Each structure stands twice: as structure tokens, then as C-alpha cells.
Amino acid sequence: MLEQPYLDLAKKVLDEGHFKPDRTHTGTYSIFGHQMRFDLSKGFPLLTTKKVPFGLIKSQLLWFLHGDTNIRFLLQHRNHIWDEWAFEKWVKSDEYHGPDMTDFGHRSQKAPEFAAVYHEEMAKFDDRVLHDDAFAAKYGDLGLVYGSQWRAWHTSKGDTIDQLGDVIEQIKTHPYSRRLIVSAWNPEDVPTMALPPCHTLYQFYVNDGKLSLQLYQRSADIFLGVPFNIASYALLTHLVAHECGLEVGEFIHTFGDAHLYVNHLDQIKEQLSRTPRPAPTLQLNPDKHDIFDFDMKDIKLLNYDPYPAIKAPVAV
Amino acid sequence: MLEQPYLDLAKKVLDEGHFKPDRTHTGTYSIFGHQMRFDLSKGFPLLTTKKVPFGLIKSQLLWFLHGDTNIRFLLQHRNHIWDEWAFEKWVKSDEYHGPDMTDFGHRSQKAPEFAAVYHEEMAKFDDRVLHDDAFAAKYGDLGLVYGSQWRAWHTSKGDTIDQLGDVIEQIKTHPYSRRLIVSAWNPEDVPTMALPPCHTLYQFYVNDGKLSLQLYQRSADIFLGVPFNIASYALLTHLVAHECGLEVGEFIHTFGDAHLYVNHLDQIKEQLSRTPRPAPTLQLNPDKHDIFDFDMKDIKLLNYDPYPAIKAPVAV
Numbered sequence: 001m002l003e004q005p006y007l008d009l010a011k012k013v014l015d016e017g018h019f020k021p022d023r024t025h026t027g028t029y030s031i032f033g034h035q036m037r038f039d040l041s042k043g044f045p046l047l048t049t050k051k052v053p054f055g056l057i058k059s060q061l062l063w064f065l066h067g068d069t070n071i072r073f074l075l076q077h078r079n080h081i082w083d084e085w086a087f088e089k090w091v092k093s094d095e096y097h098g099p100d101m102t103d104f105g106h107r108s109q110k111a112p113e114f115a116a117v118y119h120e121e122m123a124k125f126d127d128r129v130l131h132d133d134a135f136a137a138k139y140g141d142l143g144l145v146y147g148s149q150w151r152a153w154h155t156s157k158g159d160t161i162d163q164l165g166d167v168i169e170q171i172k173t174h175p176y177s178r179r180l181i182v183s184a185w186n187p188e189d190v191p192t193m194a195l196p197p198c199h200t201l202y203q204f205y206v207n208d209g210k211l212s213l214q215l216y217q218r219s220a221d222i223f224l225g226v227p228f229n230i231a232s233y234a235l236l237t238h239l240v241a242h243e244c245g246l247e248v249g250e251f252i253h254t255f256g257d258a259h260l261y262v263n264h265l266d267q268i269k270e271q272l273s274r275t276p277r278p279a280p281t282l283q284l285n286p287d288k289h290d291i292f293d294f295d296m297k298d299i300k301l302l303n304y305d306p307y308p309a310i311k312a313p314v315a316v
Numbered sequence: 317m318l319e320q321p322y323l324d325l326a327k328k329v330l331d332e333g334h335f336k337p338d339r340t341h342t343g344t345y346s347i348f349g350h351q352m353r354f355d356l357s358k359g360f361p362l363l364t365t366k367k368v369p370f371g372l373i374k375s376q377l378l379w380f381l382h383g384d385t386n387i388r389f390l391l392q393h394r395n396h397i398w399d400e401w402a403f404e405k406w407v408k409s410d411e412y413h414g415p416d417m418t419d420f421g422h423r424s425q426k427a428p429e430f431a432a433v434y435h436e437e438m439a440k441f442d443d444r445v446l447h448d449d450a451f452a453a454k455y456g457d458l459g460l461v462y463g464s465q466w467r468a469w470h471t472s473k474g475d476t477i478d479q480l481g482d483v484i485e486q487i488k489t490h491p492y493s494r495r496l497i498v499s500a501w502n503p504e505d506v507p508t509m510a511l512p513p514c515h516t517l518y519q520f521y522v523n524d525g526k527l528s529l530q531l532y533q534r535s536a537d538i539f540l541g542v543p544f545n546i547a548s549y550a551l552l553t554h555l556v557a558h559e560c561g562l563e564v565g566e567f568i569h570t571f572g573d574a575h576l577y578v579n580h581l582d583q584i585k586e587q588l589s590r591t592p593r594p595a596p597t598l599q600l601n602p603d604k605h606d607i608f609d610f611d612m613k614d615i616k617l618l619n620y621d622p623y624p625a626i627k628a629p630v631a632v
């Protein structure tokens with residue numbers, strides 16, 4: 001069925017993959033250079049062999065398309081993907097006078113009262129972020145995320161370039177070019193960023209009547225992040241298309257380093273004894289047209305039947 | 317042998333390729349999303365089935381790595397790839413008081429004394445560019461080429477970021493990351509450029525002892541430009557490697573729109589009856605280390621045996 005691309009690249013790696021040392025010191029298994037494509041007419045690429053949550057997926061992409069770079073939207077929307085990130089600027093300053101959640105990362109996991117205390121201090125960041133307007137303002141703003149990359153790229157002369165918006169319109173106007181590229185990689189900001197864009201660039205394309213998209217990813221977690229990244233880029237392709245009056249052709253995913261962690265091998269093996277069930281379907285509220293106007297409810301996923309969700313030891 | 321990637325993608329297109337309208341109005345045949353890789357241990361990827369000139373290739377890449385954005389280096393080096401470009405800013409101004417080489421493009425080809433007059437006026441641009449220091453200065457400077465992209469990216473606060481240089485050093489220092497990316501796509505300059513970077517981004521990678529590279533190209537001419545683009549990116553990989561004390565693994569080429577023109581189908585067919593001969597070899601001056609110091613002579617190509625060069629009707 002549709003997710004076989006995913007099972008085949010997971011085969012690739014734990015077989016042809018050659019180990020690589022790492023940033024949070026649990027080795028990985030890496031391949032470099034890899035493409036796979038999913039034809040969005042057969043159905044939507046979420047995985048039936050592991051539960052992948054389409055609610056977090058959804059909230060996250062929608063925050064991207066508003067230009068939002070503030071976790072307040074994500075926290076009132078039961079999304080926490082990005083929490084740690086901002087909680088990491090909080091704990092290192094003038095203000096943090098509390099019980100040191102410093103270096104909290106693996107420290108939370110295979111370590112002491114970093115089940116509570118850590119996980120009890122987040123209530124404090126996530127409450128104040130939801131309430132104190134003066135709080136989110138500053139500590140819940142996350143600076144440079146996909147929002148500023150996609151809709152407010154920063155130029156020399158102060159201005160903000162909505163390069164995604166410009167793009168979408170470029171599409172309705174000149175559907176046949178090679179030039180529908182949004183880059184999330186800006187070199188002067190790259191030097192000093194905690195995570196600089198992993199989803200690095202993407203190209204849109206009009207086929208004959210169909211839209212396609214191609215994502216270049218430079219670094220990609222096969223078990224943990226990849227399932228997700230597929231559904232968010234296939235959502236984008238449905239969303240841009242409903243907007244320009246189009247049919248959906250394929251989403252193509254090109255990889256720089258796709259890599260599995262040793263933390264994750266017994267667990268992908270487990271995925272692998274399951275045999276993919278039918279591909280789910282997507283219905284978009286047809287009344288509304290204009291994707292920046294869409295909201296949680298306007299995007300339904302029909303006929304999804306998941307194999308149980310495999311338990312993720314993260315790395316650090 | 318090594319160039320089969322190229323013959324297979326040419327098969328792809330004139331067979332699976334679906335026509336696409338175009339910018340200089342001679343239709344094309346297009347596929348979207350495509351990867352191929354060449355293992356640089358078996359030899360160097362120049363094509364034995366068509367003459368591809370390694371001198372222009374060479375001069376061109378070397379101009380890139382000096383930060384140069386001025387055709388004076390290229391013209392005293394028998395390279396003319398980029399001429400028309402600057403001759404196009406010349407003919408539209410204050411200064412051009414001559415015999416109107418206006419719109420000169422297909423106008424040169426299937427049209428009157430645009431064999432001479434056109435091709436006789438270039439002597440004037442290319443002479444003055446070689447001599448008048450005050451000429452190259454201004455009209456032979458080509459502004460934003462791969463040189464400024466690769467070694468002087470333009471930031472907000474005046475500064476120039478040598479993102480290729482930084483990269484190479486990043487390599488010697490942290491050989492194992494996902495972060496060796498050079499982007500030639502800057503969104504604020506993109507809006508208004510005659511040709512904005514086609515060779516859009518590339519990722520370097522250290523294998524176990526070997527360097528690899530991956531080029532994302534957004535738009536790619538299969539008969540005319542692709543032969544070339546392979547040899548320049550495989551040269552870069554040999555050059556960066558000799559510098560960091562490394563072995564050469566692969567060059568991987570990922571395509572956005574790879575496309576053939578109707579102008580070119582009888583001619584690629586012709587390529588195709590030939591059967592690739594042995595792959596050539598590359599010797600780099602081993603004394604010199606530091607690629608920005610290299611020069612024409614320091615790069616030899618041994619054992620190249622070409623099939624005759626097929627005559628290129630360009631498009632416009």
C-alpha cells in the first residue's frame with residue numbers, strides 16, 4: 001500500500017546503514033542521499049503500521065501558516081512538540097529563580113525527580129504562556145521558526161517577504177515554472193540557532209492539472225520524525241491545491257542524512273512484522289477556500305485504522 | 317560504466333515525460349523529482365558518449381571559488397559561458413550607442429546578420445572587459461553569481477559570510493554532521509534576477525573516511541546543461557576532499573524539473589546509439605593543498621576517450 005517507501009528505507013538503514021557517531025551521544029545508523037515518493041491519489045500517507053497522531057501534525061502546520069512563532073497557539077491546542085525549546089530560554093536568565101531544571105534533557109528521562117519537578121515546572125511555563133500576555137510575548141515567542149521562514153523572511157532593509165504566500169500566488173499565475181521554491185535555510189541566522197531548519201527547502205510543481213511537491217530534508221529521524229514529516233508535507237500539498245483549484249499528484253521526500261538510532265532498532269523491527277492496512281482519506285471543508293483561513297475542524301481524515309503505537313525512547 | 321545514470325534519466329524523459337510549455341517557447345518534456353548517484357572511486361563522471369569540454373568546466377568552477385563575479389577571468393581563460401548575460405546589461409543603457417544588438421538571443425540564430433554584427437559586437441564587449449579596468453569594473457562585474465553566493469553571502473548588517481569556506485573548515489573540524497549545506501538561494505534577491513541559482517543547494521557528508529556530496533538542482537537541462545553540471549560537482553568533491561585529507565565516495569544529483577526540449581530529441585537519440593567507453597581519471601597536483609590556491613594547470617584529467625560531440629540547437 002502507500003507507506004511501503006517508509007518500510008523500505010527503514011530496511012535500507014538497519015541493513016546497509018553504516019554507523020555514525022552523534023550530537024546526543026547514542027550512535028546512529030546513517031545513509032546519505034535518498035528519495036521516495038507517495039502518489040496522493042491512492043490516499044493520504046499516514047502510517048497504518050504505527051499510530052502517528054494527526055492532531056499534533058495538524059496544529060503544528062496550521063501554526064506555521066499563520067506566521068505564528070509563538071507556542072501560545074500550540075499550548076491552547078494540546079500540542080507540546082516545541083515546549084522544551086522555549087522552556088530552555090526560560091530556565092537560563094534573570095528571571096529563573098526556581099528549582100534548577102538546568103540541562104533537564106536526558107536528565108528528565110533516565111534520572112531522578114525529573115519525572116515531577118521537571119514535568120511539574122512545565123505547568124508553570126505553559127500556564128504563564130497561556131495567560132500572561134507579557135509572558136508569551138517574550139518567552140513564548142520562539143523567534144525563528146518555520147513561521148518567520150515561510151511568511152516573514154528577514155531582509156536587509158527591515159522588510160518581511162512572505163515567500164510562501166508569494167509562491168502560492170505565483171502558482172495560480174504561472175503554474176508551469178521551476179521557480180516555486182521556499183527555502184527555510186538563511187545562512188546568517190544558521191551559525192547560532194539551536195535547531196536550524198531540518199526541513200530545508202521545498203519545490204512545488206504543476207504537472208498536467210496536478211500539484212506535486214518535493215521536500216529536501218537535510219537530517220531525518222527514520223523512526224521518530226519521518227512518519228510525521230510525511231503527513232505534514234502531504235497536508236501542505238492538499239492545502240495549496242484546494243486553494244489553486246487543483247488535483248493532487250505526488251509528494252516526493254528527498255533526504256540528506258536519513259538515520260536510525262541504536263535506541264530504536266528493536267522497536268522499528270517490531271513495526272516491521274505488521275503488514276500495512278489501507279491508506280486513510282482526507283476531506284477538506286470545501287466551502288472555505290483560502291488556506292490561511294482554515295482551522296482545526298476544516299480538515300478531516302477519514303478511514304484510518306492504526307496498528308498500535310510503538311514506544312519511543314527518544315535520544316537526548 | 318559510470319555515466320549510465322545519465323542515459324537512464326534521458327530514457328525516462330523522452331518516454332515517461334510529459335510535455336511542458338516554456339519560458340523560451342519551444343516545449344519541453346519534463347519529469348519532476350529524480351536522483352541518481354555516481355561513485356567517484358570507479359572514475360570521474362564526464363561522458364564518453366558525447367564530447368563535454370573539461371576546460372570550460374574547469375575555468376568556470378575555479379572562478380566560483382575565488383569569489384570572482386567578473387567575466388574578465390573567464391574571458392582571459394577562453395571561457396564564454398556567461399557572456400550574453402553581461403552583454404545584455406551593456407546594450408540597454410546610457411552608453412550603448414551602436415548597431416542595436418537588442419533582443420539578440422534567437423535573433424542571433426535563425427535570423428539575419430546576427431551571425432556577424434552580433435558576434436562581431438562581442439569582440440567589443442570582451443576586449444574592453446579585458447582591457448578597460450573601468451569597464452570590467454562595472455559592466456563585466458556580474459553582481460550576483462555563485463561567487464557571491466558561495467563566498468560573500470549578503471547579510472543585513474553589511475557583512476559578507478563565506479559560507480563555503482566556513483563549511484570546508486566545519487568539515488575538518490566536525491566531519492560527522494548533517495549541517496554542511498551551502499545555499500545559493502537567497503529569497504530577497506530571487507524576485508528580480510535574470511537566472512536565479514539553478515544549482516540551488518548542496519550538502520556535503522563524511523562517510524567513514526570518504527566525502528560525499530549532494531546537489532539539489534531545481535530546473536535541469538538534460539541534453540545541454542546536465543553533462544556539465546555533473547563534472548563540476550564531481551570536481552568540487554575531489555577539491556574539497558584533497559583539502560581535508562579524504563577519500564571520495566559519491567556525488568548524488570537530485571533534480572526538481574529535469575527536462576528535455578523538442579529541439580533536442582533526434583539529437584539525444586543519436587547519443588544513445590553509442591555504448592559508454594571507460595571512465596576518465598583525475599589527478600590533482602598533490603603538492604598544493606588549499607583549493608583556493610589551485611589554478612588551471614593543477615588539475616589533470618587522464619584517459620578520456622570521447623565519442624564525437626553532438627550539435628546543440630540551444631533553445632532561446
Ligand SMILES: C#CCN(Cc1ccc2[nH]c(N)nc(=O)c2c1)c1ccc(C(=O)N[C@@H](CCC(=O)O)C(=O)O)cc1
Binds near residue numbers: 024053079221225228
Ligand atoms: C517534526 C517533528 C517531530 N519532532 C521534532 C524533532 C526535533 C528535534 C529532534 N531531535 C532528535 N535528536 N531527534 C528527533 O527525532 C527530533 C525531532 C518531535 C519533537 C518532540 C517529540 C516528543 O517527545 N513529544 C511528543 C510526544 C508524544 C508521542 O510520542 O506521540 C509530544 O507531542 O508531546 C516528538 C517529535
Ligand SMILES: C#CCN(Cc1ccc2[nH]c(N)nc(=O)c2c1)c1ccc(C(=O)N[C@@H](CCC(=O)O)C(=O)O)cc1
Binds near residue numbers: 369372398511537545
Ligand atoms: C552550467 C551550465 C551550462 N550553460 C548554462 C545555462 C544557462 C541558461 C540556460 N538556459 C536554457 N534555456 N537552457 C540551458 O541548458 C541553459 C544553460 C551553458 C551556457 C551557454 C552555452 C553555450 O552555448 N556556450 C558554449 C558553446 C560551446 C559548446 O556547445 O560546447 C560556450 O562555452 O561558448 C552552453 C551551456
Ligand SMILES: *c1cc(=O)[nH]c(=O)n1[C@H]1C[C@H](O)[C@@H](COP(=O)(O)O)O1
Binds near residue numbers: 195
Ligand atoms: C530536525 C528538526 C525537526 O523539526 N525535526 C527533525 O526530524 N529534526 C531532527 C534531525 C536530527 O535527528 C536532529 C537534529 O539534527 P542535527 O544533529 O542538528 O544535524 O533532530
Ligand SMILES: *c1cc(=O)[nH]c(=O)n1[C@H]1C[C@H](O)[C@@H](COP(=O)(O)O)O1
Binds near residue numbers: 178179513537541
Ligand atoms: C539554470 C542555470 C545554469 O547555470 N544552468 C542551467 O542548466 N539552467 C537552465 C535551467 C533551465 O533549462 C533554464 C532556466 O530555468 P527557468 O526557466 O528559469 O526555470 O536554464
